[PDB]
Design a protein around this nucleic acid. Structure first.
Lengths: 103, 118, 132
DNA sequence: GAAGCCACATCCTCT
DNA sequence: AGAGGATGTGGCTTC
């Protein structure tokens, strides 16, 4: 089964999903411009029709301790991958941002 | 409530479930009753372990004696005891010298704990 | 009843004690959730206070140790000279109605070593008296 | 297959 | 908005 952080990453690397979730251009920091839409797909991907952002964010908060994703204090719906995405993806934030043409 | 004898002829304790979920509050507050006379205010500490976990992580494993009773407030077991295996409690009443009472195969701690068939 | 009548016997018969009479492997049970660095400074400084938490890895039996005489940091009880780094501690206690003396060493770096339980002749006697 | 370990999914209380 | 506690649930693994 795919994990929430892996799914989010999957969305952040797909140009089409940029309208509801994208990088902020600051490292691996990203914001969910449409949390309801992200939640819908997450629940759809996990087969949990009653899934909503409320519940999804709770999953994210469970990442705080496991140091996979942290919250950007003060920025609504803005989180950040704190694991080694560069090693996994093989690209640095700068490159990936360019590749995905993040304006 | 109902007490149980410990490996020490001087102390008793409340009954703990045979199986429980880790970090989950126990069904009944743990207590250590002293047979003999123990000074009020005496510290009582508890620890656990076995051949799979030499020292399990616990929560609130400290309590003070009061009228021969050391009432532990929300003692939890965080470390797991292993499939089938169980923990060996080591109760320690701090006196001069310290008196320690164990209790083998006391409680089995796992991630899910008691679960109904699926 | 702080002790069992057959104090001398219980120790020489009961499996529990016998299994912990040899030089069983011991280890520091303190702060297993903190950096090794901290577990070192903690384990040491605490020893200077005449206390530490040790458990016999093999059997998994934990013990809270207090390095002081049956009654100010001691000297003979908590040794730190007998060997560079290594630390030879000693602490009496009434384990399951049986007066005994814990003894063993620990690597001031690795935070583990060996130890055992030797019956306590005197304390046993004295105790049996106070209980008559 | 039972019994374990995991990653949530749900629900909720507080600030 | 958002942190984190309590506890049930389905996937997958190991005994």
């Amino acid at each position: 089964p795919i994990q929430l952080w892996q799914f989010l990453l999957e969305l952040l690397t797909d140009k089409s999903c940029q309208s509801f979730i994208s990088w902020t251009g600051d490292g691996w920091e990203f914001k969910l411009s449409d949390p309801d839409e992200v939640a819908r797909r997450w629940g759809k991907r996990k087969n949990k029709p009653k899934m909503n952002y409320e519940k999804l964010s709770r999953g994210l908060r469970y990442y705080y301790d496991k140091n996979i994703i942290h919250k950007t204090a003060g920025k609504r719906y803005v989180y950040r991958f704190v694991c080694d995405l560069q090693s996994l993806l093989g690209y640095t934030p700068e490159e990936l941002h360019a590749m995905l043409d993040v304006k | 409530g109902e007490l149980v004898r410990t490996d020490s002829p001087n102390f008793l304790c409340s009954v703990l479930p045979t199986h429980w979920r880790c970090n989950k509050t126990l069904p009944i507050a743990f207590k250590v009753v002293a047979k003999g006379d123990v000074p009020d205010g005496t510290l009582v500490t508890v620890m656990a372990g076995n051949d799979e976990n030499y020292s399990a992580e616990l929560r609130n494993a400290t309590a003070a004696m009061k009228n021969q009773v050391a009432r532990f407030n929300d003692l939890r077991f965080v470390g797991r005891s292993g499939r089938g295996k169980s923990f060996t409690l080591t109760i320690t009443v701090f006196t001069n010298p310290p008196q320690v009472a164990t209790y083998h195969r006391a409680i089995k701690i796992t991630v899910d704990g008691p679960r109904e068939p699926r | 009843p702080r002790v069992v009548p057959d104090q001398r016997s219980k120790f020489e018969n009961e499996e529990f004690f016998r299994k912990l009479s040899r030089e069983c492997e011991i280890k520091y049970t303190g702060f297993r959730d903190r950096p090794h660095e901290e577990r070192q400074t903690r384990f040491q400084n605490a020893c200077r206070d005449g206390r530490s938490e040790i458990a016999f890895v093999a059997t998994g039996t934990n013990l809270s140790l207090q390095f002081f005489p049956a009654s100010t940091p001691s000297r003979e009880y908590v040794d730190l000279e007998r060997e560079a780094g290594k630390v030879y501690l000693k602490a009496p206690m009434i384990l399951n109605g049986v007066c005994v003396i814990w003894k063993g060493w620990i690597d001031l770096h690795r935070l583990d070593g060996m130890g055992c339980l030797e019956f306590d002749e005197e304390r046993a006697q004295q105790e049996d008296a106070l209980a008559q």
